[PDB]
């Protein structure tokens, strides 16, 4: 029953999503709740434009020991960003499209 529930929190906050080759952005937001049917944090905002480089509209989210993964609610999975600067995280895909996730600075 001691078990630690609010674990992530620092990574709370606004950010949003870059997508090269293709201009469109989308604001995001990361929730700091706790998520046991993904095992992860719940994921607000517009994630329906998410639904052009993702095969379901994600509704949460798990922050793993080496990038950020994308859940759709059910454990599956949908992407795994690799950070690869404290606060710059990209990851390949087909299509030829590079997202980006940054704290939303402006």
């Given at each position: 029953s001691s078990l630690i529930l609010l674990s992530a929190s620092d990574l709370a906050?606004?950010?949003?999503?870059?997508?090269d080759e293709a201009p469109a952005i989308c604001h995001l937001e990361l929730?700091?709740?706790?998520?046991?049917?993904?095992?992860?944090?719940?994921?607000?905002?517009?994630?329906?434009c998410?639904?052009?480089?993702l095969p379901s509209e994600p509704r949460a989210w798990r922050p793993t020991p080496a990038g950020?993964?994308?859940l759709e609610r059910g454990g599956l999975t949908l992407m795994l960003l690799?950070?690869?600067?404290?606060?710059?995280y990209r990851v390949?895909?087909?299509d030829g499209g590079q997202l980006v996730l940054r704290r939303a600075t402006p």
């Amino acid at each position: 029953s001691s078990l630690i529930l609010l674990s992530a929190s620092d990574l709370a906050g606004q950010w949003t999503l870059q997508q090269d080759e293709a201009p469109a952005i989308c604001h995001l937001e990361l929730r700091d709740s706790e998520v046991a049917e993904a095992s992860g944090y719940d994921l607000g905002g517009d994630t329906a434009c998410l639904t052009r480089w993702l095969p379901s509209e994600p509704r949460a989210w798990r922050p793993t020991p080496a990038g950020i993964a994308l859940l759709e609610r059910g454990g599956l999975t949908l992407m795994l960003l690799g950070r690869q600067g404290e606060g710059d995280y990209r990851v390949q895909k087909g299509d030829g499209g590079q997202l980006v996730l940054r704290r939303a600075t402006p």
